[PDB]
Amino acid sequence: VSPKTRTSNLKNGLTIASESNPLVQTATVGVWIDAGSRNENAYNNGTAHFFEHLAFKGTDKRSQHQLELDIENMGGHLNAYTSRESTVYYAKSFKDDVPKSVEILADILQHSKLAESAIDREREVITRELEEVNKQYEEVVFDHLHATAFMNQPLGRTILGPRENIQTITNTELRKFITENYTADRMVLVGAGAVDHDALVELAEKYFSHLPSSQSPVPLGTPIPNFVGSEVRLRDDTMPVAHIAIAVEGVSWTSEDYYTALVAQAIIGNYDRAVGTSRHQGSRLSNIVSENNLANSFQSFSTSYSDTGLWGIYLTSENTTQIDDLVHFTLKEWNRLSTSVSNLQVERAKSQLKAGLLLSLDGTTYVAEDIGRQLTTLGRRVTPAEVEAKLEAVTEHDVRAWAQKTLYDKDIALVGLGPIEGLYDYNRIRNDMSMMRW
Amino acid sequence: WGGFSVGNPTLQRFFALHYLMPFVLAVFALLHLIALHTAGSSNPLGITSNVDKLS
């Protein structure tokens, strides 16, 4: 039984949430923001990502060089990432270096220079990032998957944004973005590891007290996405490995089917030929794939957003003449979530998840990420007891009912990259989303 | 004819051969498709379709 997550508020509406661990000597503190690329329009798409670069380019007090020195002197590091709905800025340090790190974070968020000289310098760095993500095949596949599934909608935009916007982002629009979105009621200061809650709340009162509140304070994790069945093919015969993602519209964070979708995802599970245990996994798809050498790997996912999600699978394969078999058998395993799953598969997957959801949290950064994600998507940290109860309530009837409305005979979003000549047209893939025998 | 003009022998042999010939024709129809299957169907542009196939 893990220590309780303590939670306090400030007057502006900033949440402070902490989980102490007197067994470790380091602490991760940071700011989880309920804002990301989704909050941009088509004209300033890329702003959120751009700001993340400029946040470390110098403040009203410390210059870029001074900033570097300050963090180096603390001894730990700083890290940041921007997604579609969430921005994070955190600092891993020693126990007694926590007040320094909170001070640095408050400074880069509230009092960043955004000087025209630095904007112009980063404009080239970010331009180069456009031509180097091309190598990260999984990211390419998932960015195209969002682009097609949420065609011409805010969730369909990339985080980097288009080349055109990168050349036209001004300090004005940067300042406007962070003034509108980085408000206290959308921010959570999170501490995990060697932190005292009462100390963290004092530091928050010292550094984050002059944060603007938004005009209309909605609860944390408050959002209409219209999924498009569609495909993107990025054929490249020179690549040896095909990368394929297939997804349907999934579930949001607060869906009533949230846990049912996770259990269904665990029944299919993951596979990797490089891991020794993977040939012995219980998953039917895993057995088909390993026995027939159909793939190098597959990973089931159930990605959630505030008002929608994507549920599906990501496959990698060198077997270019049996891509048809791989996709065929994958979708036939999905069909069985509607037609055949019983207490056998469901209880097994629940057993695996009950542990998995706790296992994931194995260091201070993981714990801080968990607190921050849950507070910014649900508005609370869900205790392991509540999670154990919600998982226990998932029955085989629930999985079958969920699959029959979410998977069975539904439109998919499909992305293929690489030697995908063997991937059949949309209709033949989508026809595998039902069984004529049932 | 089986005789000196068209008559009964001719008619009975034409029946037997009329029954047979369609089976022969079905075999040759199958043969011409097996022969085609090496290059595949041509198409109205006259170019290769190896670039863009449909089931």
- For A161-191, the DSSP string reads --HHHHTT--HHHHHHHHHHH--GGGEEEEE
Picking from A50, A52, A220, A36, the residue whose alpha carbon sits closest to that of residue A146 is A36
Sequence letter at residue A252? S
Question: Hey, is the C-beta of B55 within 8 angstroms of any chain A C-beta?
Answer: yes
Picking from A269, A205, A293, A203, the residue whose alpha carbon sits closest to that of residue A12 is A205
Give catalytic residues of A, as residue numbers. Answer: 52
Question: Hey, is the C-beta of B35 within 8 angstroms of any chain A C-beta?
Answer: no
* SS3 call for B8: helix
| Interrupted after residues, chain B (C–N over 2.5 Å) | none
Token pair for A165: 């916007």
From the CA of B23, how many Å to the nearest CA of chain A?
34
Q: What is the number of H-type helices and E-type strands within chain B?
A: 1, 0
From the CA of A427, how many Å to the nearest CA of chain B?
10
Provide the experimental method for this PDB entry: cryo-EM
- Gyration radius of chain A over CA positions: 23
A89 touches A31 (CB < 8 A): yes
Question: Hey, is the C-beta of B16 within 8 angstroms of any chain A C-beta?
Answer: no
Cα separations in angstroms, A438 against A35, A213, A338, A400, A430: 44, 55, 10, 14, 16
Q: Where are the beta strands (DSSP E) in A85-213?
A: 87-94, 187-193
**Distance, CA of A6 to CA of A1 (rounded, Å):** 15
**Residue that the structure tokens 């190896």 belong to:** B50
CB pairs under 8 A between A and B: 4
Chain B residue with minimum CA distance to A429: B55
From the CA of B36, how many Å to the nearest CA of chain A?
22
A62 touches A8 (CB < 8 A): no
What resolution in angstrom units was achieved for this structure?
Answer: 2.1
Backbone conformation region of residue A190, classed left if phi is above 0, alpha if psi is from -120 to 50, else beta: beta
Chain A residue with minimum CA distance to B50: A421
* φ/ψ of residue A188, rounded to 5: -130, 125
Sequence letter at residue B11? L
| Domain A6-208 coded CATH 3.40.710.10 | no
How many CB atoms are located within 10 Å of the residue A338 CB?
A: 23
Q: Which residues in B lie closer than 8 A to residue A424 (C-beta atoms)?
A: 55
Token pair for A318: 């060198």
Q: Where are the beta strands (DSSP E) in A152-296?
A: 187-193, 230-235, 242-249, 271-272
How far is residue A278 CA from its own chain's centroid?
25
A263 touches A353 (CB < 8 A): yes
From the CA of B14, how many Å to the nearest CA of chain A?
47
**Distance, CA of A210 to CA of A206 (rounded, Å):** 9
* SS3 call for A425: coil
Token pair for B13: 């042999």
Picking from A299, A303, A313, A300, the residue whose alpha carbon sits closest to that of residue A250 is A303
A-interface mutation test, from B49, B50, B51, B55, most A Cβ less than 10 A away: B55
Chain A residue with minimum CA distance to B52: A421
Question: Hey, is the C-beta of B8 within 8 angstroms of any chain A C-beta?
Answer: no
Do residue A428 and residue B54 have CB atoms under 8 angstroms apart?
no
Q: Which residues in A lie closer than 8 A to residue B55 (C-beta atoms)?
A: 424-425, 428
A62 touches A108 (CB < 8 A): no
Question: Hey, is the C-beta of B54 within 8 angstroms of any chain A C-beta?
Answer: yes
The response to whether B32 counts as a known ligand-binding position is yes
| Chain A contact residues (CB < 8 Å to B) | 424-425, 428
How far is residue A160 CA from its own chain's centroid?
15
**Residue that the structure tokens 């990605």 belong to:** A303
A157 touches A42 (CB < 8 A): yes
Q: Which residues in B lie closer than 8 A to residue A428 (C-beta atoms)?
A: 55
**Distance, CA of A191 to CA of A371 (rounded, Å):** 9
Chain B residue with minimum CA distance to A428: B55
Strand partners, A19: A192
Picking from A228, A155, A226, the residue whose alpha carbon sits closest to that of residue A412 is A228
* φ/ψ of residue A271, rounded to 5: -150, 145
Q: Which residues contact B53 (CB under 8 A, 6 or more apart)?
A: none
DSSP per-residue letters across A291-358: HHT--SEEEEEEEE-SS-EEEEEEEEES-TTSHHHHHHHHHHHHHHHHHT--HHHHHHHHHHHHHHHH
A-interface mutation test, from B49, B50, B54, most A Cβ less than 10 A away: B54
Pairing of strands A230-235, A242-249: unpaired
- Gyration radius of chain B over CA positions: 21
**Distance, CA of A13 to CA of A152 (rounded, Å):** 34
The response to whether B40 counts as a known ligand-binding position is no
From the CA of A147, how many Å to the nearest CA of chain B?
24
Chain B residue with minimum CA distance to A426: B54
**Distance, CA of A295 to CA of A198 (rounded, Å):** 51
Burial A82-111 (b: 16+ CB within 10 A, else e): bebbbbbbbbbbbeebbbbbbebbbbbbbe
**Distance, CA of A188 to CA of A370 (rounded, Å):** 12
Q: Which residues in B lie closer than 8 A to residue A425 (C-beta atoms)?
A: 54-55
Do residue A428 and residue B55 have CB atoms under 8 angstroms apart?
yes
The response to whether B35 counts as a known ligand-binding position is no
* SS3 call for A241: coil
